[PDB]
Amino acid sequence: SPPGGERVGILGAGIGGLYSALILQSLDVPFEIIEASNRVGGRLFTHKFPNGGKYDYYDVGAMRYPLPKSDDKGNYQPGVMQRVGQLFTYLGMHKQLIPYYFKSNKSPGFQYFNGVRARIGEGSSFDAPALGINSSLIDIGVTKIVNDAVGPFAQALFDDLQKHTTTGWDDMMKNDAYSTRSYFSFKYLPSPSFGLPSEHFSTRVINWLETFDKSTGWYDRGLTETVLEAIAFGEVEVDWRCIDGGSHVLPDTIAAFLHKKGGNAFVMNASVTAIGLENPNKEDSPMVVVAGGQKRKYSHVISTLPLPVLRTVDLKNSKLDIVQSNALRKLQYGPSIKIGILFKEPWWTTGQDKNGEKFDLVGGQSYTDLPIRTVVYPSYGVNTNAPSNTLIASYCWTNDAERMGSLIGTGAATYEEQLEHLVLSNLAAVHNTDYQYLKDRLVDVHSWDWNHNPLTMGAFAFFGPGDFQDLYTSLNRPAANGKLHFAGEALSVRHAWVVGALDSAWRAVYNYLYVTDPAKLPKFFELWGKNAEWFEQ
């Protein structure tokens, strides 16, 4: 059935594009990967500090994976991230997965809010009474309040995954015009068991929720993203894992697997500038991709380029319908920054604060309302004879990342100095040290703003209210007479996760096989799942 000249052009050598190639290679479908940069992995990006040891790296993008439980053979239980787990096993990486400590493996991480410092779990109110948060709300806590609001939506979506239905999603979409904030302000009413007034929370209380629940401005994005990310993070049993040597090992291993025999050479350093049918009036017209100044023709094209990147590509002759072209612009992205610092020692593990109290932190995270917002201690290498000296001194989202981004990548020594001093000062206040204690231990600094990077043009999809219900489906349909397939993490309900990109590749390849070679569907299903998301042992 399929014409002898079938060849799928895969745009982007990120995890979505590499996964697409892996599926196609397993089905003996020719492909070619076009990559703008000189590296593979995309937002799987591991920075190694040259002056450091083996574990003196940090992941600028993906770094932690909340996988389902697994057996000794690498078989994963059903779960949100099962597809990621099965990929590791497929590549022979299951035993190379090491623990990721979401919470510290020893003493608890720190919380520093409203000038009040405490350990996670100590039950501090962080001066919330002075904010006007009454004692009833404090006793309940932000976590339980948010879970009561998110739980019902999340439970229906879980039932969808388990029972293979879409009613939970249809119900979510009835409320998708809500932001998390507008949901709390105009619809949510506390559970009767809380004993609170049957009234909507005030803005003061809602902002208290956001402060401790997420990041500045998170609640102005879609309520749907809040429930979906709560599901992904498992905030509603997960095995937190990271990759020994950094997440770059995953795309490196895929590239090696595809390259083993002769080699599926990649077209590197070829930025795509145009995608369209050679002749949109001919039904059998092939696709033409202009990348690096050269025209390359393919029967079908699987794009993993971020939506904002597609907006910089000439899509004339790809015949997007009016909804799809609106979707490329309106489907909202979110920002993020990370700042990694190589120190002379893992002071968070062996050091003490200005009063002699030991931090006693191994992995885990600390949280603060200061500009750095989140501090992440490394879980990799903690038990070796050369533990990591590298800290993620700041990991920000939404407004916090937008503001901090102005100090990153300026190219000016004076702003690098301002940035370092701000970060160290924030770190000192979080951990109760002086600035000089941390300055004396600092060796090198590396910082990254995914919202100032031409190859991503944002950290990841972070939809606003209405995006999922109005525009999302349009990009799950192909364009260019069925020959342009949109993929990438934006094309999932697991935005900002590797599984999102993997799901997007499954759906793109499924559509390609469905319209070009249905005889491969059985093997496609057996190797890569009967469904993108619906569970299955």
Ligand X SMILES: Cc1cc2c(cc1C)N(C[C@H](O)[C@H](O)[C@H](O)COP(=O)(O)OP(=O)(O)OC[C@H]1O[C@@H](n3cnc4c(N)ncnc43)[C@H](O)[C@@H]1O)c1[nH]c(=O)[nH]c(=O)c1N2
Ligand Y SMILES: N[C@@H](Cc1ccccc1)C(=O)O
Give the residue at shortest CB distance from ligand Y. 496
Binding mask 41-70 for ligand Y (x = CB under 6 A): -----------------------x------
In terms of CB distance, is 41 or 190 closer to ligand X?
Answer: 41
DSSP at 254: H
Identify the residue among 410, 432, 481, 531 touching a second copy (CB under 8 A). Answer: 410
> Of the candidates 119, 403, 446, 477, which one interacts with a second copy according to CB under 8 A?
403
The contact pattern for ligand Y, residues 387-426, with x = CB under 6 A and - = no contact, is ----------x-----------------------------
CB neighbour class for 496 (10 Å; exposed up to 12, middle 13-18, buried from 19) = buried
Which of 96/432 has CB closer to ligand X? 96
Instruction: State in angstroms the smallest separation of the CB of 360 from a second copy.
Output: 27
- Contact between 455 and 11 under an 8 Å Cβ cutoff? The reply is no
Contact present, 189 and 198 (Cβ < 8 Å): yes
- 217 Cβ contact partners less than 8 Å away, ≥ 6 residues apart: 210, 398, 399
Strand ranges (E), 176-286: 239-243, 272-277
* Residue 107, token pair as written in the block: 């003493």
CB 395 within 8 A of CB 338: yes
Query: Would you give the binding string for a second copy spanning residues 161-200, x where CB under 8 A is met?
Result: ---------------xxxx-xx--xx--------------
The residue among 66 and 334 lying less far from a second copy, judged by its C-beta, is: 334
**Residue 473 interacting with a second copy (CB under 8 A):** no
Q: Does 497 bind ligand Y (CB under 6 A)?
A: yes
SS3 50: coil
* Rounded CA separation 98/379 (Å): 8
Q: Smallest gap, in angstroms, from Cβ of residue 27 to ligand Y?
A: 29
User: Between 329 and 344, whose beta carbon lies closer to a second copy?
Assistant: 329
213-252 residues in contact with ligand Y (CB under 6 A) are 229
Question: Residue 362 interacts with ligand Y (CB under 6 A)?
Answer: no
**Sign of torsion, CA 412 413 418 419?**
positive
Q: Is 395 annotated as a binding residue?
A: yes
Q: How many CA atoms lie within 13 A of 159 on its CB side?
A: 13
Q: Considering the rule CB under 8 A, would residue 245 count as an interface residue with a second copy? A: no
- Select from ligand Y, a second copy, ligand X, none the partner in contact with residue 14, using the beta carbon and a kind-dependent cut-off of 5 to 8 Å: ligand X
DSSP for 324-383 reads: HHHHHHHS-EE-EEEEEEEESS-HHHH-B-TTS-B----S-EEEESSTT-EEE---TTTT
Sequence ranges of the binding site for L-glutamate: 64, 395
Sequence ranges of the binding site for L-phenylalanine: 64, 395, 496
